[PDB]
Amino acid sequence: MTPPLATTIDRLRDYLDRVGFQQIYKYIVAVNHYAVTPALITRNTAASVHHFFDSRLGGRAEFALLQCLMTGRPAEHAALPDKDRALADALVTAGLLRASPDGREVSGADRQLISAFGVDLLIDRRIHFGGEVHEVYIGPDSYWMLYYINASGIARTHRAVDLCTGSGIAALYLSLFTDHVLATDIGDVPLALVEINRRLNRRDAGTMEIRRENLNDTLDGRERFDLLTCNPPFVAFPPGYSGTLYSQGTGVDGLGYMRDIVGRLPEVLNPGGSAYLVADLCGDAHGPHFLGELESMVTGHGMRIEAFIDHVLPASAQVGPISDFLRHAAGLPADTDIAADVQAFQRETLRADYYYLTTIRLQTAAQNPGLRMLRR
Amino acid sequence: XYXGXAXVXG
Ligand SMILES: Nc1ncnc2c1ncn2[C@@H]1O[C@H](CSCC[C@H](N)C(=O)O)[C@@H](O)[C@H]1O
Ligand code: NA
Numbered sequence A: 001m002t003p004p005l006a007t008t009i010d011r012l013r014d015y016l017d018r019v020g021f022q023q024i025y026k027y028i029v030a031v032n033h034y035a036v037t038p039a040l041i042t043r044n045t046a047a048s049v050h051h052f053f054d055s056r057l058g059g060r061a062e063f064a065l066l067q068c069l070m071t072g073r074p075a076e077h078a079a080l081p082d083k084d085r086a087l088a089d090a091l092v093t094a095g096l097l098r099a100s101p102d103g104r105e106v107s108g109a110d111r112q113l114i115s116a117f118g119v120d121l122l123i124d125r126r127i128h129f130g131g132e133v134h135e136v137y138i139g140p141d142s143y144w145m146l147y148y149i150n151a152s153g154i155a156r157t158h159r160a161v162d163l164c165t166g167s168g169i170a171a172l173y174l175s176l177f178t179d180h181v182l183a184t185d186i187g188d189v190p191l192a193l194v195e196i197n198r199r200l201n202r203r204d205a206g207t208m209e210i211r212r213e214n215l216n217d218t219l220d221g222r223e224r225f226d227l228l229t230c231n232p233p234f235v236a237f238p239p240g241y242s243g244t245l246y247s248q249g250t251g252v253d254g255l256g257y258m259r260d261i262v263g264r265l266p267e268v269l270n271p272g273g274s275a276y277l278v279a280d281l282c283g284d285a286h287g288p289h290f291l292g293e294l295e296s297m298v299t300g301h302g303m304r305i306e307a308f309i310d311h312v313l314p315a316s317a318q319v320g321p322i323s324d325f326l327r328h329a330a331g332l333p334a335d336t337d338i339a340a341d342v343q344a345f346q347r348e349t350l351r352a353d354y355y356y357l358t359t360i361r362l363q364t365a366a367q368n369p370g371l372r373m374l375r376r
Numbered sequence B: 001x002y003x004g005x006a007x008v009x010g
Helices: A003-018 A021-029 A046-055 A061-070 A082-093 A140-147 A169-175 A188-200 A215-220 A256-268 A295-301 A316-330 A338-350
Strands: A097-099 A105-108 A111-116 A119-124 A159-163 A180-185 A208-212 A225-230 A269-283 A304-314 A354-363 A370-374
Touching: A003 A021, A003 A061, A003 A082, A003 A188, A021 A061, A021 A111, A046 A061, A061 A082, A061 A105, A061 A111, A082 A097, A082 A105, A119 A169, A119 A188, A140 A169, A140 A269, A140 A304, A140 A354, A159 A169, A159 A215, A169 A180, A169 A188, A169 A208, A169 A225, A180 A188, A180 A215, A188 A208, A215 A256, A225 A256, A256 A269, A256 A295, A295 A304, A295 A370, A304 A316, A316 A338
Parallel strands: A159 A180, A159 A225, A180 A208, A225 A269, A304 A370
Antiparallel strands: A097 A105, A111 A119, A269 A354, A304 A354
C-alpha cells in the first residue's frame, strides 16, 4: 500500500474505534445472526438500518460517516464533525467513498463495511447492493468454515495459512490467535483489499504475510503448517460458459482444487496439524460425491476427516442462481436457454440430485482416524 | 433459495 493510503486506513481505524463501529454492527444484526452470513446489511435491509440510526441513535452526526461506509447512505459534507470530515475527504481520494458532483455530499463507493468473527472488514458492496458483478467474494460458506475452528487449540507459535484469502477474513480470524499467518491469492482486486483489511485490524507484515501465489505452488512448496484454511473456487459451470476467478472450480466437476489440497495435506501439514475447507458439494440422496474420494486418506494416511453438512438444496433450486450468475458475469442477452444447459450438465456430468454445503475438517496423524459425516 | 449460490454470491 502507498503511504497516503496507509495513513488513511489508520485514521479509518481510529474513527471506527471512536464511535464503536463493531459494537453497533453487532447490535444491529444481533448475536443470533452475526456468524450465520455476511448478507445481513443489504439493499433489502438498508432502510431499516437507516431508521435505526435516525430513531434509536438520534441521527447523531458522529454516525454519519459510519453509515456512508456501512450502507452507502449520503451525508452532507458540512454536517460531518470536523475530524470525520477530513477523513471522509481522504476516503474519497482513495476511492473508498464517493463525493457528489457538487461536492456537497459523501456517499458509498464499491466497498461495504461489516464485522465478522471479531474483525472489521471492507467487502465488495456489489455482492449485497445493486450493480455490476462483484469482484471479491464473501458468503455464508466463508463464515461456516471459520465457525468450526477450535480457537482455544491455536498456539501463538502455530504456523497458519489461509489459501485463496479474498477479503482476508479467514487470515484475519486466524491472526486473532496465532502470531504467524500467511494469506495468499492471485487476483489483483482481492489482493489490494486484503492489504487494506490487514491494516484496518492493526496487523502488518510482521504477523500476517500477504503473498501473490497460486495455491498449487503453495501446496507443493516446502513450507509446513500447523493450521490451514481454504475456501477455493468450487463451482462447476457447463462447457462453453465462463465464470469468474472466485467462482469457477477446476476439473470436470469443479472440484479440482479440493482434490489438489486434500491430496497434499499429509505432506504440507505438520503431523497432528489440521485443515479446514468449505465447498458446496454435489451428490445423491445419501450425500456428497466428494466424500467418497476421501477414504483413501483415512486408510492410506491415518487421517480423521469430519464433514459438517449445514445446508441441503435440490439441484433444481440452483439452476436459477447459476444461470443468472453466468448471464450477468459474461454480459449475455436474455434469449439463450442457459437454464437447460445447467440442468443437462448437473444430470450428465455432476450427477447432482442435491447440493450439500459442507465444511470439512481434516487432521493428519490422528489418534482416532476415520471419516465422519454429520447431517441434520 | 436462501442458502444458494456459494462461491458465487449476489
Ligand atoms: N489458483 C488460485 N490460487 C490462489 N487463489 C485463487 C486461485 N484461484 C482463485 N483464487 C482466489 O480464491 C478465492 C475464492 S473465494 C474465497 C475468499 C475467502 N477465503 C472467503 O472465504 O470468503 C478468490 O479470492 C480468488 O481470487
Ligand atoms: Na469458493
